[PDB]
From a paper:
The [name]–[name] complex plays a central role in the posttranscriptional regulation of gene expression by catalyzing the removal of the mRNA poly(A) tail, thereby repressing translation and promoting mRNA degradation. The [name]–[name] complex is a multisubunit complex that assembles on the NOT1 scaffold protein, which consists of several α-helical domains that serve to dock the other subunits of the complex. [name] is an evolutionarily conserved E3 ubiquitin ligase that contains a RING domain, a linker region with coiled-coil propensity (CC), an RNA recognition motif (RRM) domain, and a C3H1-type zinc finger domain (ZNF). Assisted by alignments of metazoan [name] proteins, we uncovered a 23-amino-acid peptide motif in [name]-C that binds to the [name] subunit of the [name]–[name] complex and hence was termed the [name] [name]-binding motif ([name]).
We obtained crystals—but only of a heterologous complex consisting of Hs [name] and the [name] of Dm [name]. We obtained two distinct crystal forms, each with two crystallographically independent complexes per asymmetric unit and diffracting X-rays to a maximum resolution of 2.1 Å. [name] binding is highly similar among the four [name]–[name] complexes, and therefore only one of them (polypeptide chains A and B from space group P212121) is described. Despite its highly negative overall charge (pI = 3.6), the Dm [name] interacts with Hs [name] primarily via hydrophobic contacts. It engages the concave surface of Hs [name], contacting residues from three parallel α helices (α5, α8, and α11) and burying a surface on Hs [name] of 842 Å2. Importantly, the very same surface of [name] was described previously to be engaged also by the CBMs of Roquin and Bam (Sgromo et al. 2017, 2018). Strikingly, however, whereas the CBMs of Roquin and Bam run in parallel to the α helices α5, α8, and α11, the [name] of [name] runs in an antiparallel fashion and hence is structurally and evolutionarily unrelated to the other two CBMs. At the C-terminal end of the [name], the invariant Dm [name] E835 pins down the C-terminal half of the [name] α helix, using two hydrogen bonds to coordinate the free main chain nitrogens of Hs [name] A84 and H85 at the beginning of α helix α5 and compensating for the positive charge of the helix dipole. Additional specificity arises from an H bond between the side chains of Dm [name] T824 and Hs [name] T138 on α helix α8, which is deeply buried in the interface.
Author numbering:
A (entry chain B): 814 to 838
B (entry chain A): 13 to 285
């Protein structure tokens, strides 16, 4: 009855890298 | 002491959701308390202006759907709001009022999106997590609500073209619907509903044979196994079952998964009878 992961926790992990690699100097 | 000071800060953050100048920071801090504060959902639901403020964050992303312009920062902020809505969706004190207000429908524009960009892929993933938390309650009220919506066609499209994580949650949602007696009868009610599901499940098996995934195959096999409980679906599965499920195609990816191997053996045994 579980997925083996947390969808929101994995979202925070994925978006943390992209937030830093999308912003302008 | 510290237990008191934390509860007073949460009330402050909840009130800060009502103001646009302080909502972003309040969304961040409250989403950190989603697991540790069991009373969080009733505190959010107590004033409806709080729920309206959370939904305003949701609505503010609708203009980003066409064309897909959602950035990672914009997606992260709304996923925090979705995490707080997930808290309300799963708490037994607020789950019924949450469904009576049809709040999950505000997430359906996100599930309908097809953009393969990471801000949208994670937006669908977190949105699917809200639905996933609803079906984990194992309530009949949840299944009846989902059957009156278009959640099945939305999940089926994600199951065939989404990322591995989104496919897994979407397949799990379909699995929980099928495990309910009314959900199984709903999918087998018409030829179109069953054939659409069987075509999607068969397509996923083909994709899994090229890119194996033990966690995704587990839920695909469970869906097939539950479908075999229906007599008309069982007869159809005797002809359209993918050969990869009858062969040893997935014996290597299931070398440590005793549960999926048991379900797969039960599925083939249900179809031989």
């Amino acid at each position: 009855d579980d997925l083996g992961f947390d969808p929101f926790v994995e979202t925070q992990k994925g978006l943390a890298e992209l937030m830093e690699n999308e912003v302008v100097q | 002491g510290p237990h008191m000071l934390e509860r007073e800060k949460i009330y402050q953050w909840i009130n800060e959701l009502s103001s646009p100048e302080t909502r972003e920071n309040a969304l961040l801090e409250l989403s950190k308390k989603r697991e540790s504060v069991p009373d969080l959902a009733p505190m959010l639901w107590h004033s409806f202006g709080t729920i309206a403020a959370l939904l305003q964050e949701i609505v503010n992303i609708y203009p980003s759907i066409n064309p897909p312009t959602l950035t990672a920062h914009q997606s992260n902020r709304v996923c925090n709001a979705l995490a707080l809505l997930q808290c309300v969706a799963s708490h037994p004190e607020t789950r019924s009022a949450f469904l009576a207000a049809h709040i999950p429908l505000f997430l359906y524009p996100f599930l309908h999106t097809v953009s393969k960009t990471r801000p949208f892929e994670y937006l669908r993933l977190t949105s699917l997590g809200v639905i996933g938390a609803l079906v984990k309650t194992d309530e009949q009220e949840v299944i009846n609500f989902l059957l009156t919506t278009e959640i099945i066609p939305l999940c089926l499209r994600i199951m065939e073209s989404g990322s591995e994580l989104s496919k897994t949650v979407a397949t799990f949602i379909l699995q929980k619907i099928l495990l309910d007696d009314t959900g199984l009868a709903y999918i087998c009610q018409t030829y179109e509903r069953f054939s659409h599901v069987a075509m999607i499940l068969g397509k996923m098996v083909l994709q899994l044979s090229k890119e194996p995934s033990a966690r995704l195959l587990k839920h695909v096999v469970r869906c097939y196994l539950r479908l075999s409980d229906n007599p008309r679906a069982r007869e159809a599965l005797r002809q359209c079952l993918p050969d990869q499920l009858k062969d040893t195609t997935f014996a290597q990816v299931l070398k440590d998964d005793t549960t999926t191997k048991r379900w797969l053996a039960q599925l083939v045994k249900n179809l031989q009878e």
